[PDB]
Ligand binder design. Structure first.
Ligand code: ATP
Lengths: 827, 85
C-alpha cells in the first residue's frame, strides 16, 4: 500500500540518475573555455542533485517507519528537480606550438641525450641496408620529448633524401595529417595539397608512390589513441632500407604498438639536479648564482618540487623574475607555500596548466573520479595501491555488468591504465607481485586538488590554506590533515567519507557518531581506541584501522550487512567477535595471525583475499571449511602446532578452490609434512612463495611440472638437498621471471657445494630477470650468453677451492646487464 | 531448413541480449539479468538447475530444447499471457 508508491518511484529515480550522469559526462568533456558559464552553473546544480538522489536510493536499499521519511524526501527531491528544470529553461590555437619556435642556443643538456638517441637509431646507417625501424619516445607532460626529436632531426637530416615534421592532435582528422605529411615531403609538387580533397585512400597511395627508392626519416609526434596510428602505418609498408621513423607519445601503452621491440622504446627521464640548477639560474639570474647567497636554500627547495621537468622550471623561472628578482625571501616563501592550495590561480601560469590538463581531459569517464580521488592524500608520501583500490570499490567508482569479473581485477586495470597514461609513478613490489605504492607529481597534485575544490568533491583542511568553503551544509568527502585547529562538525548530516592523517586531534575534539550515513571510515596512523559506535553506522563499506591502538572490537558489528573490507593489522586486538560470521559480504580481510578466528568462516562465501591466517589449535571441520569458499585470490599461511594428517587434509582441501593465484606457507625449523607429491594444484598460480628459511623440503615437489601451473613467475622455495636435474626440470617452465632457491643442508651441515650441470635443453631461460641461488654453486658458465637474454642479477656460492680449477673460466659479457655481481666466496 | 554461422550467432546473441528481447539459460554462461521483472522471451537449454520462475508475468513466449527438466521444476500454467508455446 504505502511502500508500493516508493518502490515504483525508485526505478523512475534511477532512470533519472542515469540520464543525469550521461549529461554530466557529456559536459565534462569540453574544456572550460569553450563552455558558456550558464551551462556550467546548471551542470554544478545537476551534480548536487545527483548526489542527493543517489543518497536517497542507497538509504532505501540498505534500510529495505523509515518509509515515511523516505517518501517525504522523494517528493521533495522531485520538487527541486522540477524547479531547477524550469529555472534553467527560463534563460537562454595550441599553447605548445609557439614553444616550437624557440631559440636553439637556450636549451641546456640536450646534446648528451640527443647524441645517445642519434647513435641508437643511426648506428645502422653505416651499411645503410638495415630494414626501416621506428623509435618511440615516452614521457609525461613536458619533458622536451618533442624538442629532443627536433634536435636530433635537425642534425641528421642532410643524410636522408626526404623528411617531414608532422604533428597529431588529441582528435586528429586523418586527411589533415596525411596532407601535412605530403606537404612536408615536397613543397613544390604538393604546394596546394590541403585544398585537394580526394579521400583517406588515394593520398595514402600518393605517399606510397612518392616514397619509392628513397630514405626519408619521417617523424610523427603526439600520437594518442594508437587506433589513429595504425592508419598511418599503412603509409610505410613497402621495404625501404636506410630509412627510419621517430614517434613521440605521452601514452606508454601505444609505444609497444610501435617498433615491436623493447630495445627501441626510449623512456626519457627528468633533468639532473645540477642541470636543473643551471637552467633555473640561467633564466632568473644574470651571470652568477653565488651573488644572493641568502635565497639559495629556498631555491633548492623550490627546485626540488619541480624535480626535473624543463617545463615547471621554465614557468617558475619566468614567474619568479618579472624584473630582476622583484623580491626575495618573501615572495619565494609565498611560492613555496602556495604549492598545494592556490598557486594555480595565478597569471601567465595558465599557459602551462592547459598542457597538463590535456591528459586529464583525455581520460575516458569512470576514471575522472578515480584520478580526482588522489587529492585526498597529503603532499609527499607513498599511497598503497591496495588502499586506493578498496576505497574506490567501496565508493562506487568501480562496477560493470559482465558477471565474469570479481570487481577487484577491474580496479587493478583502472590503476594500471592510470599508470601507463603517465600520471602516476609506480614504485615498489608488495607480496601480491604487483605495484606496492604510488606517488603523484606535485603540480599535478595541486592542480587536481584545485580542480576538485572547484566542485564539492573533496574538502581539505590545511594550515597553509586555512580556508573552509562558504557552504558547510553540503560536504561529502573530508580529509583532515596536520591542521588540528578548525574541527567544526555541526552541519554535515549526509557525510560521504572521512579520514585522518597522523593526527591526535581525532576523537578528543571530533565526533563520528553524528554522521548517520558514512560510506568509508579510514583512520590508520592514529592512536585512538574508542570504536564501539560502528553498529549505529549502517552503510559503512570500508573500515581501515591499521596501527590504531584499538584494544577490542564491539560485538554488535554483525548488523553491518553491507561491508566490503576490514583492515585490523598493526592493532593490539587478539580475538575477533563471534558476530563476524553473521556478517555476509566481504572481499578482503587483513588480520594478523596473533588474532583468533571464530568458527563459521564457511558463511563468508564472498571472500576474495585473506591475509595472515594463523592456524593454531584448530579442529578438522574448521580446516575443511576453507575449501568451501571458492573465491580467494591471495592467501597467506603460518602455523606451528598441527603438523599432522590435518595438514594433508587441508593440502587437498585447497585444491577445491580454482580462483587462487598466489600462496605462501610460513613455518619455522620444520619439514613440510603437508604437501604430498600426488595432488593437483589450482590451475592458476603466480607467486607460490615460502617466506620461512629454517624450513625445507626433502626433495623438490613432483607436481611442480611444466604441465601444471605454467604461469608461475615467483618461487621463494627452499629445500634440504640439491640435485643437478632439478634446475633442468625447472628451466622448462615458461616464464619464471623471479627465482629463489635455498640449500638447507649446505648452510646447516658440512656439505661441500657441488656444481650442478645443465644437461638437457639449450637455453631454459627465455626470461628470468632475477635468479637467486643459496647454497648452490652457479658459475655464469652454465650455458653461452644466448641462454638467459633477460637476467640482471645472480647470486650463488663459490668455493675458494675452485679458484685454481679450470671450470670457472668466466669473464665474458653476456647479453643482459650482467656486469655488477658479487659472490660470497668460501675458503 | 537453415543454418547460421557460429560467430554471427553469438554476435546476434549479444546484440539481442543488450535489451530484453530474449533470455537464454546456459551452463557456461550462468548469467541472468538483474531485472527479473522484465522478461518477454525465454529459451531454456541444456541448463536444468537454474530454472527459476518467480516473477515472469509478462511472458511472450517459451521454448524448451530436449530437456527432461520441463514441467517437473517449471510451471507453464501460471503465465497468464502467452503468445506461443
Ligand atoms: N632540455 C631543455 N632545455 C631547455 N628547455 C627545454 C628543454 N626541454 C624542453 N624545454 C622547453 O620546455 C617545453 C618542452 O616542450 P616539450 O617538447 O616537452 O613538449 P612535449 O614533450 O611534446 O610534451 P607535451 O606532451 O606537453 O607536448 C618547451 O618550452 C621547451 O622549449
Amino acid at each position: 500500500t504505502l511502500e508500493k508508491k516508493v518502490r515504483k518511484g525508485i526505478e523512475s529515480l534511477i532512470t533519472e540518475l542515469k540520464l543525469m550522469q550521461a549529461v554530466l559526462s557529456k559536459v565534462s568533456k569540453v574544456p572550460a573555455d569553450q563552455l558558456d558559464e550558464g551551462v556550467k552553473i546548471w551542470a554544478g546544480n545537476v551534480k548536487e542533485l545527483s548526489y542527493q538522489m543517489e543518497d536517497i536510493v542507497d538509504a532505501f536499499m540498505v534500510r529495505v517507519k523509515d518509509l515515511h521519511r523516505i517518501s517525504a524526501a522523494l517528493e521533495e527531491v522531485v520538487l527541486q528537480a522540477k524547479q531547477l528544470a524550469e529555472l534553467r529553461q527560463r534563460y537562454e590555437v595550441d599553447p605548445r606550438m609557439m614553444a616550437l619556435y624557440t631559440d636553439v642556443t637556450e636549451l641546456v643538456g640536450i646534446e648528451e641525450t640527443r647524441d645517445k638517441l642519434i647513435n641508437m637509431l643511426t648506428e645502422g646507417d653505416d651499411w645503410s641496408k638495415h630494414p626501416l625501424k621506428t623509435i618511440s619516445i615516452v614521457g609525461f607532460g613536458g619533458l622536451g620529448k618533442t624538442t629532443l626529436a627536433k634536435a636530433a632531426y635537425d642534425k641528421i637530416k642532410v643524410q636522408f633524401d626526404c623528411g617531414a615534421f608532422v604533428s597529431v592532435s588529441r582528435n586528429p582528422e586523418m586527411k589533415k595529417v596525411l596532407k601535412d605529411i605530403l606537404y612536408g615531403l615536397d613543397k613544390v609538387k604538393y604546394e596546394n595539397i590541403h585544398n585537394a580533397a580526394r579521400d583517406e585512400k588515394y593520398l595514402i597511395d600518393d605517399i606510397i608512390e612518392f616514397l619509392n627508392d628513397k630514405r626519408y626519416l619521417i617523424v610523427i609526434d603526439d600520437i594518442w589513441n594508437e587506433k589513429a596510428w595504425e592508419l598511418i602505418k599503412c603509409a610505410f609498408s613497402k621495404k625501404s632500407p636506410g630509412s627510419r621513423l621517430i614517434t613521440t607519445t605521452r601514452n606508454v601503452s601505444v609505444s609497444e604498438a610501435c617498433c615491436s621491440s623493447e630495445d627501441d622504446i626510449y623512456r626519457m627521464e627528468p633533468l639532473s639536479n645540477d642541470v636543473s640548477r643551471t637552467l633555473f639560474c640561467k633564466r632568473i639570474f644574470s651571470q652568477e648564482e653565488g651573488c644572493p647567497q641568502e635565497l639559495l636554500k629556498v631555491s633548492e627547495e623550490i627546485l626540488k618540487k619541480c624535480g626535473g621537468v624543463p617545463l615547471a622550471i621554465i614557468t617558475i623561472a619566468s614567474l619568479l623574475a618579472n624584473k630582476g628578482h622583484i623580491k626575495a625571501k618573501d615572495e619565494w616563501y609565498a611560492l613555496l607555500s602556495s604549492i598545494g592550495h592556490g598557486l594555480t590561480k595565478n597569471r601567465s601560469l595558465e599557459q602551462m596548466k592547459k598542457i597538463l590538463l590535456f591528459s586529464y581531459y583525455d581520460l575516458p569517464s569512470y576514471l575522472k573520479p578515480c584520478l580526482l580521488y588522489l587529492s585526498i592524500f597529503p603532499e609527499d608520501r607513498e599511497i598503497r595501491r591496495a588502499r586506493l583500490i578498496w576505497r574506490w570499490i567501496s565508493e562506487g567508482f568501480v562496477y560493470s555488468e559482465k558477471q565474469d569479473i570479481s570487481l577487484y581485477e577491474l580496479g587493478d586495470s583502472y590503476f594500471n591504465e592510470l599508470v601507463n597514461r603517465s600520471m602516476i609513478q609506480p614504485i615498489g613490489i608488495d607480496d601480491e607481485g604487483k605495484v606496492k605504492a604510488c606517488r603523484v607529481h606535485d603540480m599535478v597534485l595541486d592542480l587536481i586538488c584545485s580542480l576538485s575544490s572547484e566542485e564539492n568533491f573533496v574538502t581539505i583542511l590545511d594550515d597553509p590554506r586555512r580556508k573552509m568553503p562558504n557552504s558547510e551544509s553540503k560536504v561529502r568527502r573530508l580529509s583532515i590533515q596536520n591542521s588540528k585547529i578548525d574541527v567544526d562538525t555541526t552541519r554535515m548530516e549526509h557525510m560521504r567519507s572521512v579520514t585522518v592523517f597522523s593526527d591526535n586531534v581525532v576523537g578528543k575534539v571530533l565526533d563520528i557518531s553524528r554522521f548517520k550515513v558514512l560510506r568509508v571510515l579510514d583512520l590508520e596512523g592514529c592512536h585512538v581506541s574508542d570504536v564501539g559506535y560502528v553498529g549505529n553506522l549502517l552503510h559503512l563499506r570500508y573500515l581501515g584501522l591499521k596501527g590504531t591502538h584499538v584494544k577490542d572490537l564491539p560485538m554488535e558489528i554483525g548488523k553491518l550487512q553491507f561491508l566490503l573490507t576490514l583492515d585490523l593489522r598493526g592493532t593490539k586486538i587478539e580475538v575477533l567477535p563471534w558476530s563476524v560470521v553473521q556478517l555476509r559480504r566481504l572481499m578482503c580481510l587483513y588480520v594478523d595471525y596473533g588474532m583468533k578466528l571464530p568458527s563459521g568462516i564457511g558463511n563468508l562465501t564472498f571472500l576474495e583475499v585473506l591475509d595472515d591466517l594463523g592456524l593454531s589449535d584448530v579442529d578438522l571441520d574448521f580446516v575443511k571449511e576453507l575449501g568451501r569458499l571458492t573465491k580467494l585470490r591471495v592467501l597467506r599461511l603460518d602455523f606451528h602446532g598441527f603438523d599432522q594428517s590435518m595438514g594433508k587434509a587441508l593440502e587437498e582441501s585447497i585444491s577445491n578452490m580454482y580462483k587462487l593465484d598466489s600462496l605462501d606457507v610460513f613455518v619455522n625449523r620444520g619439514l613440510i609434512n603437508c604437501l604430498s607429491e600426488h595432488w593437483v594444484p589450482p590451475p592458476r598460480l603466480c607467486r607460490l612463495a615460502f617466506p620461512s628459511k629454517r624450513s625445507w623440503f626433502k626433495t623438490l615437489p613432483s607436481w611442480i611440472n611444466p604441465s601444471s601451473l605454467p604461469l608461475l613467475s615467483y618461487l621463494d622455495i627452499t629445500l634440504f638437498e640439491v640435485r643437478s636435474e632439478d634446475i633442468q626440470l625447472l628451466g622448462t617452465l615458461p616464464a619464471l621471471v623471479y627465482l629463489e632457491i635455498w640449500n638447507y643442508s649446505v648452510f646447516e651441515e658440512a656439505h661441500e657445494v657441488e656444481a650442478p650441470v645443465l644437461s638437457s635443453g639449450a637455453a631454459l631461460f627465455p626470461c628470468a630477470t632475477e635468479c637467486r641461488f643459496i647454497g648452490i654453486g652457479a658459475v655464469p658458465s652454465m650455458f653461452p650468453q644466448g641462454a638467459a637474454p633477460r637476467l640482471k642479477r645472480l647470486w650463488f656460492t663459490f668455493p675458494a677451492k675452485w679458484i685454481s680449477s679450470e671450470n670457472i673460466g668466466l669473464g665474458m659479457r653476456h647479453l643482459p646487464s650482467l656486469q655488477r655481481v658479487v659472490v660470497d666466496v668460501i675458503s
